[PDB]
């Protein structure tokens, strides 16, 4: 009479059916990978890599497929924006079909390993009872894991046999799948240095092999064997749950903060690029350099790439989103069509005014136009009676350099107020919202959703470590206690 | 151990000493709990007594400055330090203990020592339960406060721009944190704080109801009007009538417990689940995945200038909180908002 | 371990502690009064919150070199 929450304990003491259920979970995961890839390819728009990349459309597995080398498709389109001459069998559709067929094969193998559960391999040769030599199993599977880690690091990513991984410029303007040379110096521990990824996966992998050869040759000591409850599968479950939630915390942190393994051309910008003005400073530095060359403001701003300006927009901030604001970023805000340009606000005196940008914390932010010396010179007041820094009172005009509105100046207060309100969000873009019926509230980029999901899983699996490990240590008393 | 005990090792002597039943059980977990917890509490007291927040939040938050128990608080460091661990030897303080106090490193000190103290305390619960051979359900229950502490004081600040937005260790500082959450994240509307509220209120309800029901269904067992004396710790019979309690609550409320084990498991279960759901919600807020708005109602209000609900009024209240608290709550932003841009009602 | 009642009712305990508890209390009073508390914990005195040029609250606004910034912002 097992309660509904204990049913899957039936395979605790059955190695064969444990293999079967683990095969079934593996088959389900592979099937989900294939199906998700197929759905994403079906609903993906590859026409415009600029202003409409993958992270704008809510793609979740496309970033990873592109990160590890798969770029082309059988539909004739490349994620980089070129033409697919010969995508080969390793296109997105190829990966989806492969993971799907693997899921089916694992389903069949699960059926078999379930029917023929009573294999003599799982019998203890001496006693004849069913038993698993957990130290030796860990040694074998760790040796395999280390071998695979070294192989992936040395051949893949380095491009010796594999294709490499996604490497981009610091500002995410020109990124592509490239081979990576390992970084053997201290800079190999720079999180944003790509060269660490091969070298690590090499060196660590090597250690794994050696570690395997130890945990496969040397039997654990009796004191350690009974202390760590080696020989109980639930102890292994507790330790594995702990390790996996540790890894989940690490990956969530490394994606929220960004690293060489989570490029912004695949997951979108981080919130710390908006907070610290990572792109705004670069744009203004390029503009200033062009001006120092003698160019006018219009030419200097026309020289700015549209993708770089698009990164400098608060709508792409992963932290400007909602828990139930579902779907693609294009579903909340319209599909980007073009860059309006750069708005320069100037009072009737000629003093240049800058619009205070919305911080990541604020859902709504009042519009303030600030002097170069940090002195508020204009605003859109909430109380139009006896206002002091009104747009009409100060006489603010907005001139657009570059983009769609190039060399266009607006002086009517309504248009100036509208454009200042738009510019408080960063660079101003035109959005087509009729196509997807965008409501008008920002969604979160795929890196935000990934971080949220895997952080919640990390917490729940910390509770899993606690529970399954308590059950491990207190196995004798978890069938009941004999009073004191 | 199992086949034989082999020879006694120095680990055996250490275990025998640490596992003695003295007045204060130290155990192996004590070596992590006692120093860490002692330093955390002592750091909080020194900070609330002598350390100030003039250079961190531009606020006076110590007794020596004139603050009382309510307003004193070990404030979190400046936002420009980001998520720096603020080691007293680190590149920020560079060894200057006084300046390390001034920079706000005491907050990081207290938070980290408190986290390791909580780890040590759950380890202590496990060790003591194993010593007396009991199922360690209280450590499993204490996992919920650890989840709350981790999600609020560690995960949330790491999701934001720095430790500055963590809760400062104090009473009024915690109240500021709460009002900040209401204003910015609309934390009340989040279904996970809803589940946490339900869990905590239900746990309080269960505590009160179980206590009252036991105290009002007691068997006589004595002749004194003081019913507390009519109890022996080693007696086997139950001190209160389960049948009478079940009948009473069945006829008053409609349903009633009939299993003591299930009743006490439910008492354990409700608050833990509530706190864990609240922790998940706080993680979501750490990523700013806030349940801020119902887009349908916002769109309807935008199209219909006369549609109003309590939700829209709450949104207006949040807007007021944000606008009027931003200037002084986040000094690093340098928000010199003129009084004409602050949202405001009529004649107030 | 002796019961707490026996120790707290013992004259020896009180004659031992009647010169140490006041000694600690007086040590704390001296620590506050002699200005040592401000000196070691860095909390500014009531006449040191604002300097000649800084007439508002200070702001750290720097990750590294924060030692020099807080040193120049603090009372000299």
């Amino acid at each position: 009479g097992l309660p509904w929450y204990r049913v899957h304990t039936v395979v605790i003491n059955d190695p064969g059916r444990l293999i079967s259920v683990h095969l079934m979970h593996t088959a389900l995961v592979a099937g989900w990978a294939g199906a998700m890839t197929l759905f994403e390819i079906a609903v993906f728009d590859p026409s415009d890599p600029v202003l409409n990349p993958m992270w704008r459309q809510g793609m979740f597995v496309l970033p990873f497929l592109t990160r590890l080398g798969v770029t082309q498709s059988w539909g004739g389109w490349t994620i980089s924006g070129e033409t697919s001459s010969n995508p080969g069998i390793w296109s997105y559709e190829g990966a989806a079909a492969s993971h799907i067929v693997l899921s089916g094969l694992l389903f069949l193998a699960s059926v078999w390993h379930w029917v023929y559960w009573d294999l003599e391999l799982f019998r203890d040769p001496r006693t004849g009872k069913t038993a698993l030599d957990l130290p030796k199993i860990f040694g074998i599977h760790l040796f395999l894991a280390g071998l695979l880690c070294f192989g992936f690091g040395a051949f893949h990513v380095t491009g010796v046999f594999g294709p490499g991984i996604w490497v981009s410029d610091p500002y995410g303007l020109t990124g592509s799948v490239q081979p990576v040379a390992p970084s053997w110096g201290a800079e190999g521990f720079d999180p944003y240095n790509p060269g660490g990824v091969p070298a690590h996966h090499i060196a660590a992998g090597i250690l794994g092999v050696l570690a395997g050869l130890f945990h496969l040759c040397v039997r654990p000591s009796i004191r350690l064997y009974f202390g760590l409850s080696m020989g109980s599968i639930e102890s292994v479950l507790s330790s594995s749950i702990a390790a996996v939630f540790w890894a989940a915390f690490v990956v969530a942190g490394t994606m929220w903060y960004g690293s060489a393994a989570t490029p912004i051309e695949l997951f979108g910008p981080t919130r710390y690029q908006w907070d610290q003005g990572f792109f705004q400073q670069e744009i203004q530095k390029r503009v200033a350099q062009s001006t120092s060359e003698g160019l006018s403001v219009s030419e200097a701003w026309a020289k700015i790439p549209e993708k770089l300006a698009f990164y400098d927009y608060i709508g792409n901030n992963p932290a400007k989103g909602g828990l139930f604001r579902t779907g693609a970023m294009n579903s909340g805000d319209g599909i980007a069509v073009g860059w309006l340009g750069h708005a320069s606000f100037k009072d009737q005196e000629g003093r240049e005014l800058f619009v205070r940008r919305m911080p990541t914390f604020f859902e709504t932010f009042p519009v303030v136009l600030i002097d170069k010396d940090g002195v508020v010179r204009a605003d859109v007041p909430f109380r139009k009676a006896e206002s002091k820094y009104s747009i009409e009172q100060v006489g603010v005009s907005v001139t657009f350099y570059g983009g769609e509105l190039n060399g266009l100046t607006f002086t009517d207060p309504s248009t100036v107020k509208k454009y200042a309100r738009k510019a408080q969000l960063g660079e101003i873009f035109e959005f087509d919202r009729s196509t997807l019926q965008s409501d008008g509230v920002f969604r979160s980029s795929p890196r935000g959703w990934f971080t949220f999901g895997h952080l919640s899983f990390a917490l729940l699996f910390f509770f899993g470590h606690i529970w399954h490990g308590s059950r491990t240590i207190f196995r004798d008393v978890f069938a009941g206690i004999d009073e004191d | 151990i199992g086949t034989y005990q082999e020879k006694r090792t120095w680990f055996d002597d250490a275990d025998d000493w640490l596992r003695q039943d003295r007045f204060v059980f130290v155990g192996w977990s004590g070596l992590l709990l006692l120093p860490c917890a002692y330093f955390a509490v002592g750091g909080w007291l020194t900070g609330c007594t002598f350390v100030t927040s003039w250079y961190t939040h531009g606020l006076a938050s110590s007794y020596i400055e004139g603050c009382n128990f309510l307003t004193a608080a070990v404030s979190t460091p400046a936002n420009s330090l980001g998520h720096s661990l603020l080691f007293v030897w680190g590149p920020e303080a560079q060894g200057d203990l006084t300046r390390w106090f001034q920079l706000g490193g005491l907050w990081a000190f207290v938070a980290l020592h408190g986290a390791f103290g909580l780890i040590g305390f759950m380890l202590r619960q496990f060790e003591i339960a194993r010593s007396v051979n009991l199922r360690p359900y209280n450590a499993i229950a204490f996992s919920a406060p650890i989840a709350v502490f981790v999600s609020v004081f560690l995960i949330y600040p790491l999701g934001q721009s720095g430790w500055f937005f963590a809760p400062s260790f104090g009473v009024a500082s915690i109240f500021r944190f709460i009002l900040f959450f209401q204003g910015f994240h609309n934390w009340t509307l989040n279904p996970f704080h809803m589940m946490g509220v339900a869990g905590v209120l239900g746990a309080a309800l269960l505590c009160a109801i179980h206590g009252a029901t036991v105290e009002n269904t007691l068997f006589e067992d004595g002749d004194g009007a003081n019913t507390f004396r009519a109890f022996n710790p080693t007696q086997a019979e139950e001190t209160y009538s389960m049948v009478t309690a079940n009948r009473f609550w069945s006829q008053i409320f409609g349903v009633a417990f009939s299993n003591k084990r299930w009743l006490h498991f439910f008492m354990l279960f409700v608050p833990v689940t509530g706190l864990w759901m609240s922790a998940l919600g706080v993680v979501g807020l750490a990523l700013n995945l806030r349940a801020y708005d119902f887009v349908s109602q916002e769109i309807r209000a935008a199209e219909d200038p006369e549609f109003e609900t309590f939700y829209t009024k709450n949104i207006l209240l949040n807007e007021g909180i944000r606008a009027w608290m931003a200037a002084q709550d986040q000094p690093h932003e340098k928000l010199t908002l003129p009084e004409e841009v602050l949202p405001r009602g009529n004649a107030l | 371990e002796r019961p707490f009642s026996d120790i707290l009712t013992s004259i020896r305990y009180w004659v031992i502690h009647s010169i140490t508890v006041p000694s600690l209390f007086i040590a704390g009073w001296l620590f506050v009064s002699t200005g040592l508390a401000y000196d070691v914990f860095g909390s500014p005195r009531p006449n040191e919150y604002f300097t000649e040029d800084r007439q508002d609250a200070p702001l750290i606004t720097d990750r590294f070199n924060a030692l020099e910034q807080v040193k120049k912002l603090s009372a000299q």
């Binding site: 400073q281 120092s292 940008r357 | - | -």
Partner: peptide, 28 residues
């Protein structure tokens, strides 16, 4: 040739939290 002072004075009004302002702030 870029005027770093003007660059910082442009970033500060739009965003005071910019890493341009905070870097080498005590020097200013």
């Amino acid at each position: 040739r870029v005027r770093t002072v003007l660059d910082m004075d442009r970033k500060d009004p739009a965003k005071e939290e910019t890493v341009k302002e905070l870097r080498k702030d005590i020097n200013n």
